[PDB]
């Protein structure tokens, strides 16, 4: 199903792996998806998070606080966590229900808050972005693009 991801959504997922690698992490978790959505910096997900005051630095600090880094950066393919897998599966249905045949950055973000339980969700709540508020912000920005 990655073939239905937009270019930018694929770049998100590719960057999430490197977010994990550069923290000396050995799985790609939901929090690395969150880092990648913000760090890629152009799509509706990034805009939605910026517009709620969720910054790359705030997320990095919470990931250091909650997870911490390993001793060494791994080479080769880093596997998705169970919850990251769930997020990416959910993203497909967020896209279809919003009337899209491709999975964009916003649908990954929506999948992440739909999953609602892993490290990224914990970080968003800690930083003051309640999951319903995040969802409604995405809907609000998408509605503005219908003009």
């Amino acid at each position: 199903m990655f073939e239905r991801f937009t270019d930018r959504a694929r770049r998100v997922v590719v960057l999430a792996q490197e977010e994990a690698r550069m923290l000396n992490h050995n799985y790609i978790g939901t929090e690395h998806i969150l880092l990648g959505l913000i760090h890629e910096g152009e799509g509706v997900a990034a805009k939605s998070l910026e517009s709620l005051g969720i910054s790359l630095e705030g997320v990095r600090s919470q990931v250091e606080e909650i997870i911490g880094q390993g001793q060494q950066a791994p080479s080769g393919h880093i596997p998705f966590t169970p919850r990251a897998k769930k997020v990416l599966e959910l993203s497909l249905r967020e896209a279809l229900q919003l009337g899209h045949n491709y999975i964009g950055t916003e649908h990954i973000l929506l999948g992440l808050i739909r999953e609602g339980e892993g490290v990224a969700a914990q970080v968003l709540v800690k930083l003051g972005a309640e999951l319903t508020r995040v969802r409604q912000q995405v809907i609000q920005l998408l509605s503005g693009y219908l003009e």
Partner: peptide, 7 residues
Amino acid sequence: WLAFVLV
């Protein structure tokens, strides 16, 4: 799909 980037 769905274990690694991008399988």
